[model samples]
Target: MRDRVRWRVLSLPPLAQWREVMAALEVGPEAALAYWHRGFRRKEDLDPPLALLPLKGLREAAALLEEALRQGKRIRVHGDYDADGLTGTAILVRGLAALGADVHPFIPSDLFLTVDCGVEVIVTDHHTLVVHPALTPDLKEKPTGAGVAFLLLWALHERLGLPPPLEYADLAAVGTIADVAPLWGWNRALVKEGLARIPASSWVGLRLLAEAVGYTGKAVEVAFRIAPRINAASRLGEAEKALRLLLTDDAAEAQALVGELHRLNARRQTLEEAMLRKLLPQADPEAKAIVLLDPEGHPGVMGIVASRILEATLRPVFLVAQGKGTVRSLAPISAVEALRSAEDLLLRYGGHKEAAGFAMDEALFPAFKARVEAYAARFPDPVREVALLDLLPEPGLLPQVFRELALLEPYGEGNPEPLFLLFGAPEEARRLGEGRHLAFRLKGVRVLAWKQGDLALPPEVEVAGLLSENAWNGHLAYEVQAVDLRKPEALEGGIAPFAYPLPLLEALARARLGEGVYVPEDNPEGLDYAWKAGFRLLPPEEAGLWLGLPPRPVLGRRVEVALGREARARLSAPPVLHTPEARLKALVHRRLLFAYERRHPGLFSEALLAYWEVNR
Candidate 1:
């Protein structure tokens, strides 16, 4: 059975080197390991100032803008429809206005959309460059459109000996995060500083929207809460509303626009749910890749739907609406390469390796789907990996660890919040959100597992998740956000339950055992290996040597396991599944359902074999 989640404990620096990191930083293991994970090992690297990286086109764009301002030539700032584009437009327009330049903004990408004929165009964008000489860079740490705009103005202001354009950093930060750009080096400094400045932002609209949405100083405040509202305007085909909201200086206008965006965002959510309701049941887990054509699907929301489906199946997803579509892919299966395999069938396609977009004639859908799926099948194994910082700290030290985690703030894209492995017994389990969620207690701290209320956790659980401060009814307490949970016994020597890699397991077993090994009754493969290795295979009852976990605790030197697909396929379901109408019974245990599906993919509907599976 495929594990619902895989737990990969991060490798720490050596004991001597780890101590040096801790002592050099003067922080505990929690903070030190986090810094180490982020590739920071020095005191100076922590809390470094936001210094400008030398971008190739920064000076040219700055000079052009400066000359236009000096000559009094009316300048027009054009950006895309999304949050990043809108925020970038706002930053450029506002920054120009502050510098006493007559500037305007619009939301369209074409060179002729908002311009008067073919004048000299100064393009500053982060999208894939179609032709040469665009201001985009080829770097792992690239800036968003707004980040580029912010940098252009910062260069002008710096050359003029004025204060750096820190005021627009908040917007730059929002755009970077909204666009899902790499958050390291330049972007990291910008977002880190920008998050700090958000509360005191000079933009009236930004301040009001932040206040309305309870904008705490976190990157996710903008990414999840604020960006969606901004993006909703364009998704509903009213780009100017969001642009107006970002540019407005009047509190009344900002307040009214915020309310309008809220409603629009609600409408967008309704549309997304409606589309997913139709698409989820049709998704086939057996497919190497998911390729669907929903003529009724909103083109604006298909990309998001593709993302949702990718997360669900952990497979490459290419979803189409009408003639247009978006593709989201996993590791080893490049979105661009997959689309390239069917390039002749597509009218046009463009995007990075992991995510891309395309358009095609409706008649060619079958051929296109076949080509992409075949491309994905070439890579047989695509893992869904989650990295952990360390094991859970003691309950008494959680608060301190939580507080120190703030030092690694502005988590997004490349950098993420630290996750810990919590291995213990769950206490006082309770249902929440009308039984769509689960909560329990571990070491006096509450653990919240959203969208897992159906999971009937065993007495002892191994959880891979995040720790956050939960606030409810004026009470604030440390809580664990359980991203994944399973029985502690499901893992054998850090190996997955099914699909055992024999060579790896044999190597590990050889290192762990000193004498004879125990081979389970059904594992003839392990018996062969033990015999070849000149070790005696003992029976489960006697238990001097063991292949896998025994039914009862006994004195045994555990060895390699040979639990194959058949063994996990025969695993017993929970008692609830033994009813008279078993096939029609609602699946209440997600752990069991995941196990079953792993053994036999796409045999049952996760949404409703008989009842709905909770959506995370």
Candidate 2:
């Protein structure tokens, strides 16, 4: 079955802004514009300092921790079961031990400070809190549980006049990235500082993990490579083993634990695939929501399967096994809200908007499924497969672009690897990987289209893909992985709207009738005098000069506009007055873009857009 998808390139910022970014960043147009487009204006936003952000109740939490340590209390670090939990638990346990305190790792309580959950308990977490005295700040940076733990560790170290928790920052980095927290503010600082330490970590286990994952000291490597191995232990019902890897001082034991994690991760892969294969066929394609009760499904992998189901079906999914279940949903649909609607049937339920957990009687599966589907049906058409591309790549600057991507390092939840739109025909196209994938060259860069072995391509194709430097056995070359490809004629893209300077528009006003310019179908008011001044206006099909604000993306290039205050205020008339449907959409997109570019904290509309665009 074919999926319906749309492609939209980000509106290029004004020439002035783009030029400013290029100059300020001291980088080529490709990376600089992308940086600008992704909302990084200042150089510091690219690489924030590792200094800690002030948490509301940080000192109190640290004091309590200090008191427990001085009293030689048997402290127990109870963390969540995921990578963030394990790593955060490790940070506290190991750091406390180093500071001459006794601590154990688990879901424990001995003057217990839970690492990831809180309210009425001594807690240090990044989750949204409910009337908790713990230092939980719901900032845009989106700190993870491990991040909170590390913050407390840092404070403890400072009070004791010892070295800061810089040593534990790597573990915190692994947890923060693995938990998919936003990498901005202190989170960015921590990850940036921590990723550098993984290679030379004092902990034997962390260094061994570097070896296990071929650690590249990058955030993506941690997220995709190291994080999973740590998580595999708990997913397969052995959380302690993974914890031991982090806490053990013995190299041989660390190696043994690493091997165990590797083995479990392989088993998890096998188990996850088997469960996905079993659960997918059970999903009803026509259902507004996917509600599967896989009696055979492992409770440990329910969340993973639910997420995968949501991806495959493009619908909210509730995957349950035994009595436990996990829910995953996309935008316009709230997993927690849906569960709330059926709270009476749930034994218990809790989580954020997109991801949540719940428990219900196995017999209530029918009622639960029906309730969730009815709730979802109200918002028909919630699925949107989009490729939100950044900018047109400069073929000449491909190498430089690849290197500059490092500046936006540690791309994950809050930030992502930039994707570009390449317009060119595929050359030297052939099947690779036993004919399961297609490989070609576009604009002098090698392009790989996975699972598109039989796709027929047009002579000129608009390809949306990521550009990266592929280094194989000491050879470095540029490569593109095609996320979406289509004929140029079928593309639907929007141009960045700009208010032309009065002088620039006046130049067109005096143009000869022979010099044809396209006046859009929905031309702005008060612009007709130019047409009457012996200036020729042609239809979109045959125009060379794009003289007005085209309602949509024009098919060809033209002289772009120059920005001026008067023209901007004049042309920025209420969009509702002209082509309201299209213009309003454009206005909304513009608002979201501008809001994010300005670095307004807590704004997630832009992040949501990026998420939908990349379909991650």
Candidate 3:
């Protein structure tokens, strides 16, 4: 009786229209919806308004370079220590060289710049700095100012009509994206025009690197993938490799460098996983934000890891790595703004909202952490919870609705795809092929749900999903990719239904099941039940839970069950109780069938049950 009740609650929604939607849309339904929700937008909110810039800085930079060129003064391009910086550096250096200027590029080290002693004289950069003669007896020094952008603009304006050297196009695009510069007005035009020049780029090294990364299309978003690979080079002990890749004129050498970058990226992933294992457990669960310290972590990789960790935990994360005498800090979006208030606590820091990095004395680490934490604590928890739109959509609306959504293309940060809540929708979902995927129909629209063999849906429920267009096998149709579902509310004047936090529930299951136990499903129902029941169901793969698990020989093709002593003892006698696996499979099938019935009341039959059971 308990098993049946659990099964009923878990097996309610049928995804009957999934397959048909897939066939019509010409794409696997699940993939289709994933793309649509993550990519599509509405026409009403089509493109964001353009924000123009004054270009005063550009004009000033150009004027400075023009004067220097006219006077034949020596100049240097001070570049940053990243791909974007390198690209920018390469472009301006090559461009200036073409324009007959004595220009060179200088990249700062991961460590602080040091003074070099030569012939009883000290040299520290070419810039001059004034000091009180008593403070510095040497009395001569150079002052560094501004950034790569300022330098480039100044140089270009000074060398008027010199074509501004085309080498920096790739670098400019990378810098534009990494900096998250607004995609409007001057920047938007610059990126769009610059990206077009990438394919025909004269820089053999960058072109080969692009090819190695399988960048076949001509979209600027390719930067998103390539930037990380280049970043990996800096993270794993070769910041110069990235710049070299951009400057190399030989195709063969460029390919080799790109291969090295790919290998380094793999190593970075391993290191990241290890760091997460150590750090996640130590995280302050009650705290609204996280600040982690790892003296051994790579400073270059810390920022990327912080961003990834923030996504996984939905908490503002700051990771600090100690390098030599300096402590480098990396913070994802949530902490980016918070760093502003704590700037006085650091030696040096700069970055935008999504991510930032800084350096300070190792001794000041604790103080910096405390100050940032205090600042973050003052603000209320961010109110940006996931919103579930109630559409209760009918089948006929799928085509027109999906078409309208397409007008909102080229979606990205600041703009997101809409998700709709489907109530009393089609349920009869079944998997096709060896993948055991769920497919079915909703009104005239067909849909497909991947990995649905394990889902516990319910009849008469509301499905939280994104509307999507499917394109595959020469057809195009519309469907919904399921996110979450629940029983519809029966009363009025009350709060709408909400998605139970699945991650929190999964954590509870892990606690009850003990380590090494696989809970099979990570959902609110499974999680809630495990928390309430004290003991949790373990997947067959996790047979280690049974203490001295038997080493049975596989003489015949039969499913094996290795239950713990307590559980086995209870089922040792007669009318053999069904295993959790069997119960779960049955629940999934029943829910799908129930959903199908809701959509097509008379479609339910013994034949349908046979088909559903066979697929399950």
Candidate 4:
């Protein structure tokens, strides 16, 4: 039977129609044709642009700042700990200095301490501000201030001067985008203005850096490509290099700095890949949320990595790293308010509810983990899974669909490229390239699947993935990058019971069955056994189940399951007996039984009996 399915077309509305039009022009034939059809749509007009701010807050702050400036006060631009805070601080310092006011920029260290002092302070930050007892001794602190945008409006009004106009555009755009600030109101204006100024700006450094990084056009383009490189410098513990690069005025010197940044970014990528390799194996696949802590992980990159993992796994992710005896967190969310319920559990926290950062003592790790896990556990599973739709399934659709999709240009976090679900893909899908470089083809669409080895795909499977335009051989075409795949059993319409929680499936199998043991020789009868038992077998490599062994087996298994490498090592060492078959049987039995008990306690009795039958 021909598989007929109802498909929804995602296109730009009237208000966003310009995005489509521009996308077609820049992206060329690979653009989707829907751009010209009903795709051009718009949302309701919320309010006038300037209406976003209070009528008098900007005026009041300006008046207060002007009075201080006139009184010869040494003004300080106090900012947050990330790129946005740094850029905002730079804007205020440059603008205020142009007005001949004594201005200096100060950023709180990762330790959350105010390290610099000034006469009059204008703060622009997003991370939760903790008025260090040593920094602000008298005032009862409250969380009432707006972020950088408000601070800029205030500075612009009081100082009555244009910010050095030197590349503040790129910095402002990066800050706003990375912080995931609202794209409406004052932010809209700032992005609009900043995007227009980026390409032609005389800030010798930013413009050159943009070109060097292959940033061609649009504010959003700069945000995604250029900004991330700048942020990478800081994320990899090279904040000083970023600051120096931004501050450099010489064209040659700026180019040199840009090259250095490129190198640093490459190194950062390697480090991130290594960390992901280690952490992904330790993640619990069935978890609605992933909470991972690595003391040696880069605190800054953890958030970026968490965001990536969230997209890949379609789950909220919290990645924490301990540094200097303190734990820092990068939690990605759909809204900032989501974190309010866990406020008391954090030592210091800040940002929008959707995306926030927090820092606390290592001692609070257990409490923090519990709070986040509990909160995640309470979140209702989405009523309907949003299936990504691809307009064209084969390479032939590349020409028309590419044109259509391109018309809806400039995609990012809030507005992402269109994704589609393709059913029954073949496993013969081959990937090209090696190391940090890789690309592939699936369902007749070329895909740029970075680190392709990290993905777990099955033969003759259906895939849910995103479609993107890839420029290769001087031609632009659409590619389908798989996110998740539907297995054979899912297609066969059988009751594929999972003896293990989906998240812990792979780990449990690896802990018991051993790595790469999912192949035919390793488990020739395993799949049949699981299927007969009403469970579908999944590849252990891709499931990301990190197991933990209890001090003693609460269950009756002679052996315990270990989820990660460390746990495996502990199990494999001397005294455990090195016989291969005995070790294998013990590991598999322990893991399968544990998973069966944990996920389906009702099957515990049967599972234990099954375990004995299978092993004995």
Off by over 4 Å in 4: 1-56, 67-72, 107-121, 124-167, 182-189, 218-224, 236-240, 263-267, 283-301, 305-320, 323-407, 420-616
Using TM-score as the measure, name the better of candidate 1 and candidate 3.
1
Task: Please list the residue runs of candidate 2 whose C-alpha ends up more than 4 Å from where it truly belongs after superposition.
Answer: 107-110, 118-121, 129-140, 385-391, 451-454, 488-616
Off by over 4 Å in 1: 1-4, 109-118, 129-140, 433-436, 443-445, 451-454, 472-475, 489-616
- TM-score for each candidate, following the candidate numbering: 0.76, 0.78, 0.54, 0.54
Residue 277 lDDT in candidate 4: 76
Please report the TM-score between candidate 1 and the true structure. 0.76
Against the hidden true structure, what lDDT does model 1 obtain?
Answer: 0.69
Residue-level error in angstroms, candidate 3, position 562: 57
Pairwise lDDT winner, candidates 1 and 2: 2
lDDT of 1 by residue, 311-401 (tens): 7777888988889979999778899989998999999998878899999987898888889888988986566766666667656667767
Model 3: per-residue Cα lDDT over 234-333, one tens digit each: 6676767877787778888888888888888888888887777777676656566677888887665666666566655556777777732221222333
Clashes of each: 3, 0, 48, 41
Q: Give lDDT: candidate 3, residue 69.
A: 56
Please state the error at residue 149 of candidate 2 in Å.
0.8
Model 2 TM-score relative to the real fold: 0.78
Candidate 1 displacement at residue 451 in angstroms:
6.7
Best by lDDT: 2
Number of the top-ranking candidate, with TM-score as the measure? 2
